[PDB]
Amino acid sequence: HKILHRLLQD
Amino acid sequence: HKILHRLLQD
Amino acid sequence: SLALSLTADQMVSALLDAEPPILYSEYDPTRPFSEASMMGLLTNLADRELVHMINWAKRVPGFVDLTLHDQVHLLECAWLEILMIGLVWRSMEHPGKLLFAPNLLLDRNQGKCVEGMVEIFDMLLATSSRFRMMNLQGEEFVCLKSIILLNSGVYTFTLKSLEEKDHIHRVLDKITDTLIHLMAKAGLTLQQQHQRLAQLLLILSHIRHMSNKGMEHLYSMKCKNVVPLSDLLLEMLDAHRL
Amino acid sequence: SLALSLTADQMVSALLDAEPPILYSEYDPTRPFSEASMMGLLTNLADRELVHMINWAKRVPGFVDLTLHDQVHLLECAWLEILMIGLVWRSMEHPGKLLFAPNLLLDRNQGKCVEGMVEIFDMLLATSSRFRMMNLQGEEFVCLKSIILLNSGVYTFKDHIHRVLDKITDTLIHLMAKAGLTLQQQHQRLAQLLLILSHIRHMSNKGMEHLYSMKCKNVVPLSDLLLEMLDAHR
Ligand SMILES: Cc1cc(-c2ccc(O)cc2Cl)sc1-c1ccc(O)cc1Cl
Ligand SMILES: Cc1cc(-c2ccc(O)cc2Cl)sc1-c1ccc(O)cc1Cl
């Protein structure tokens, strides 16, 4: 979905 | 010169 | 100069007296709306408003003290921001609606009329909602609009050639003082004053954002050549292209 | 939200400790740069800075209290502004130059290799010069950067965010009062600092258009992360 999602959730 | 230049002048 | 010799109340009265009039659009409620005509209405209105804005800018304290070249640059940078903050101010009492003119009141569904405008409409509506919840005062509005004119182009201008930019910053400081004066007069504590001042100036960042996006839409409108743009407006558009 | 309970000093210390590292570019001494090489270094650098920015954002008081989607919206809207004010801050003590990295210090002549970069270069230099003449302090910088994060996307979604914004304003004033400024000088400087944010927004907007323009050329390889951040603005 979004890389940004992963980075924010770690 | 420019229209703006003119209007600012008058 | 006389801009630095004004009291806060005198600054306010000068700005209020200099307020441009509210113009009407050529909106014909019998004529069916099309994207070409609808956009024609907005661009025609802006063109006529530009003439009044120019003569309004001359009455902004400190503006005539600048060179003709500097005046030109400041207006070229700020004209759409100034139109927009005027629009959202007029629209405060009309939730979910944008009052472009007394006879032209639009919501977002009539924005879909035009490819790209709905996003701009939503941003403008949100700005107007923010002003409404802050209960923006007319005295604060005219201060903010003068700040936009002087600030938006001040960082894109050598020698001295510096005292000119330094003058603008002194006038900007005077307007800041005026804003604080208005808020203290309204019964705000010092903490509340600084907070409201911050809240108001941060909105100017969003107005800049809307203006940038708007200019891109407009430049797009020039390349379609379906919406007729006036010569002044085209010359205002090309200034951001350079 | 425990962000609102913090004192001004606690707010400052929290933000200072959150500061992301200063990253380096490549050590290749091959000069001058080509357009492809220049863009490569700049985009590679930003890609790595974005990862640290996200961990910085989560450490900005009040940001953790937001939902994931809201956190995403704010970062998508503000990421280039945040990179720019960082760049501008780093370049303060290097007049006429921009310090992208300690081993990547550039002048405006080196911006001509890529078309339309000199425009943004000059704007960035102007901002940096403005900060220098204002004698911007690190404590003020981190307040401004956090303000950009919380403010830039707040009107395109808020009361919690506005309350956190208010506390950062209180912090900024606190710093100025601490530095000996009078009341008049406090709100004047506050205003001057916040108006510069409008210009940072302007620079970001110009910057985003050029990045998109180079996205349509498929010359410089943009990372998927950079592409997704860029796509959010279109
Ligand atoms: C000239 C003009 C063009 C507008 C517009 C509409 C859709 C869009 O995507 C982009 C844009 Cl820019 S809005 C506008 C305007 C006209 C008169 C006035 O008092 C205020 C405004 Cl903001
Ligand atoms: C990634 C990136 C791309 C930039 C750029 C280059 C050319 C142009 O026309 C337009 C633009 Cl925006 S500038 C920049 C950057 C990279 C790292 C950093 O810390 C800060 C910045 Cl501002």
Q: Which of C72, C80, C231 to mutate to test the interface with B (most CBs of B within 10 A)?
A: C72
Chains D and B touch (3+ CB pairs under 8 A): no
D105 strand-pairing partners: D99
Cα–Cα–Cα angle for D105, D108, D114, nearest 5°? 95
Query: What totals of helices (H) and strands (E) does chain C contain, helices first?
Result: 8, 2
Q: Is C105 left (phi over 0), alpha (psi -120 to 50) or beta?
A: beta
Residues 6+ away with beta carbon under 8 Å from C175: C11, C143, C146, C147, C150
CATH at residue D153: 1.10.565.10
At residue C66, what are phi and psi to the nearest 5 degrees? -85, 160
Contact between D221 and D64 (Cβ < 8 Å): no
Cβ distance of A3 and D51 shorter than 8 Å:
no
C69 sits in which H/E element = helix C68-90
C161: nearest Cα among C62, C70, C46: C70
Rounded CA-CA distance C190/C141 in Å is 20
Q: How many alpha carbons fall within 13 Å on the CB side of residue D21?
A: 7
Which ligand has an atom closest to residue D21 CA?
2
Fill in the amino acid letter for C128: S
Rounded CA-CA distance D179/D192 in Å is 16
D153: nearest Cα among D231, D71, D97, D224: D71
Tell me which residue range forms the domain holding C32. Answer: 1-242
Q: What is the resolution of this structure in A?
A: 2.1
Show the tokens assigned to C161: 């050639």
C144 sits in which H/E element = helix C138-151
Q: Using what technique was this structure determined?
A: X-ray
**Which chain D residues have any C-beta within 8 angstroms of a chain C C-beta?**
123, 126-127, 130, 147, 151-152, 155-156, 162, 165-166, 169-170, 172-173, 183-184, 186-188, 190-192, 194-199, 201-202, 205-206, 209
Name the domain count of chain D.
1
Crossing angle for the helix pair D117-134 and D183-215, to the nearest 10 degrees = 160
Cβ distance of D224 and A8 shorter than 8 Å:
no
Distance from CA of C47 to the nearest CA of B (A): 12
End-to-end CA distance of chain B: 13
Contact between D85 and D7 (Cβ < 8 Å): no
Residue carrying structure tokens 């001057």: D192
Residues 6+ away with beta carbon under 8 Å from C207: C81, C84, C85, C127, C148, D198
Alpha-carbon torsion, ordered C54, C60, C64, C68, to 10 deg: -40
Cβ distance of A8 and D72 shorter than 8 Å:
yes
